[PDB]
Amino acid sequence: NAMIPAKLKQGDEIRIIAPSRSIGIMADNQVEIAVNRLTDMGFKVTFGEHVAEMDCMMSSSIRSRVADIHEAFNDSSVKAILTVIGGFNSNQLLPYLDYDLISENPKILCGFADITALATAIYTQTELITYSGAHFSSFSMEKGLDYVMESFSDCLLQKEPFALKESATWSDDEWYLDQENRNFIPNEGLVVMQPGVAEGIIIGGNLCTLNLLQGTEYMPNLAGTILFIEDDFMTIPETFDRDLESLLSQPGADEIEGMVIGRFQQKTAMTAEKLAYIIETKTALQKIPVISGADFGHTQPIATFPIGGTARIDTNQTDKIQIIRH
Amino acid sequence: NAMIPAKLKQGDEIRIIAPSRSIGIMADNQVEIAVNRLTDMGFKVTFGEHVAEMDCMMSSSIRSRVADIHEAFNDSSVKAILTVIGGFNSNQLLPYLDYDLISENPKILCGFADITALATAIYTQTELITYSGAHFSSFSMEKGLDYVMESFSDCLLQKEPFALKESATWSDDEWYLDQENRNFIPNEGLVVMQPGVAEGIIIGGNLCTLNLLQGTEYMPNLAGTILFIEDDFMTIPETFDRDLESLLSQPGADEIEGMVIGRFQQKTAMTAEKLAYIIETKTALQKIPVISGADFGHTQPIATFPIGGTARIDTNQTDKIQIIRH
Ligand SMILES: Nc1ncnc2c1ncn2[C@@H]1O[C@H](COS(N)(=O)=O)[C@@H](O)[C@H]1O
Ligand SMILES: Nc1ncnc2c1ncn2[C@@H]1O[C@H](COS(N)(=O)=O)[C@@H](O)[C@H]1O
Ligand SMILES: [Mg+2]
């Protein structure tokens, strides 16, 4: 069964790697804040040897990112690994990873969006539980951050079940470019789209990214899972639909226990009607409960949750999402 | 080998269907144009009962689309089926299609883009050969069609080999909105990115669409195939890359014979340099011919080619892409 890596504790070292886009797209100023932020939380922050390498795709070579990953896992002082930022190409690295090395060195790996690929592949090949959550760059956000740290802390510094609470406010701002002028919005809350109750193994993160593992070794079976699914502003409802239909045609999809969907960005123009239409036409979702408007995805603020950890959904309760194993 | 549907004779009936987006996204006069065009080419044009149904996704219900599809294969006056246009959701239809009925009513199905899903699936399930080529709506283009009819005719009215020939000019115009103010461009032609000779089965069409069948029983094995791939302006170099990585990780990708890539649209901003870097990082393409800039995809003009047919690629000839079986 699944390996829960040791929770972080004060003084632990945290390694920053860039398996997707280069730390070079972050301004010197942003780096400083995130460093200090995690340092104030009580951690030695260190950086992979190649984080700053940059090519024409704003990323770096396969061999470089692979090495930073292996070093990070092989270094025993490192208790958690944080990705710099997402991007597009972490799926390139999958064939080249020493999964024996990784399973021999269980520890936290956390990041989201493109990192879904890497994180999911490591769970499926290794059974190490990984995390969909804050990037390193996530901690460079001056306003609204409290929720991020609280969920990051609930998930990674403590071990008891916790609830994926609804934020009080949420936003959809390009905050790295403008940090003072933000637009927090009262969170109208989660939205029950299909009622029910269930319990299961957590799979998901970024939908179009998880699609990429379909037909590979690295794809997890979906039997007995709660799906936590999200996508960014590039997806429109029609692309979300086709990408979801694809996911729900994969092995184990007949036996999905439920789904939680993260808040969409504004440009996606997802509406309640469209989302309802999309879900209502999916066969594998017919009986199980489904929620939308959760605090993970590309809006602020994000939670941090385990891929390969367990959850319970109860639509009648106030706190609808409970994380149990994590 | 596969089955080849009867080539289109003269006066033969053509049924138009809308398995993706509805015909309601076409202006009345744009349809009048395509109808006259295909009539002049000497065919009886008819429309499925449901082609004008229209939902909030600019498409139509599953069961409507599936009915027009079945009524069209089963009607024996009908010798070719053309899709109105592409979009997003032809992959929804796949579990509901009567493949046995299709298998015993062999005939031409042609269209491209989203239709890649429908066409490929029909092929993998019935091994009836289908076509990536003109939509009904493709025949409403006033300027620059001559190439399109010619390729259409090469593929579907004649039985002998032919070359997927370089066009003299090409464009990337919103021509349905401005039929007169076009912007033709002299075609620098096919780039040989990797030289070679190779022969195999043609698989491909729209890349992110073909991705959607991955991990399903509708996915073709890729052993002994020539991949003809293509994507539209919504893809950027990084997304073309991750989608390509994902395809070249599928069953059979270790035994691909060669690859042809269709001309990118301009908003994609694919540079010869980026494309080369993307290709050289792909393991499955190490020792095989790869050609770029071909005449298919989302620029005009478009060629029509068979899915499940056969092609020879010869970097030494001046006719470098040959379509043998169709
Ligand atoms: N320097 C930067 N450049 C671009 N985006 C930056 C950024 N810093 C923070 N974000 C943020 O990171 C998110 C993108 O996440 S992802 N898909 O994992 O890469 C966006 O919400 C940006 O606002
Ligand atoms: N009425 C219309 N509305 C939108 N696009 C139209 C169009 N007529 C032609 N195209 C065109 O046909 C292509 C779309 O094919 S596809 N991806 O398979 O749906 C694009 O190049 C459009 O410009
Ligand atoms: Mg995809």
UniProtKB/TrEMBL annotation, chains A, B:
<dbReference type="InterPro" id="IPR003507">
    <property type="entry name" value="S66_fam"/>
</dbReference>
<feature type="active site" description="Charge relay system">
    <location>
        <position position="230"/>
    </location>
</feature>
<dbReference type="GO" id="GO:0004180">
    <property type="term" value="F:carboxypeptidase activity"/>
</dbReference>
<feature type="domain" description="LD-carboxypeptidase C-terminal">
    <location>
        <begin position="199"/>
        <end position="313"/>
    </location>
</feature>
<dbReference type="InterPro" id="IPR040449">
    <property type="entry name" value="Peptidase_S66_N"/>
</dbReference>
<feature type="domain" description="LD-carboxypeptidase N-terminal">
    <location>
        <begin position="14"/>
        <end position="133"/>
    </location>
</feature>
<dbReference type="InterPro" id="IPR029062">
    <property type="entry name" value="Class_I_gatase-like"/>
</dbReference>
<dbReference type="InterPro" id="IPR027461">
    <property type="entry name" value="Carboxypeptidase_A_C_sf"/>
</dbReference>
<feature type="active site" description="Nucleophile">
    <location>
        <position position="113"/>
    </location>
</feature>
<comment type="similarity">
    <text>Belongs to the peptidase S66 family.</text>
</comment>
<dbReference type="InterPro" id="IPR040921">
    <property type="entry name" value="Peptidase_S66C"/>
</dbReference>
<dbReference type="GO" id="GO:0005829">
    <property type="term" value="C:cytosol"/>
</dbReference>
<feature type="active site" description="Charge relay system">
    <location>
        <position position="298"/>
    </location>
</feature>
<dbReference type="InterPro" id="IPR027478">
    <property type="entry name" value="LdcA_N"/>
</dbReference>
<dbReference type="Pfam" id="PF17676">
    <property type="entry name" value="Peptidase_S66C"/>
</dbReference>
<dbReference type="Pfam" id="PF02016">
    <property type="entry name" value="Peptidase_S66"/>
</dbReference>
<keyword id="KW-0378">Hydrolase</keyword>
<protein>
    <submittedName>
        <fullName>Lmo1638 protein</fullName>
    </submittedName>
</protein>
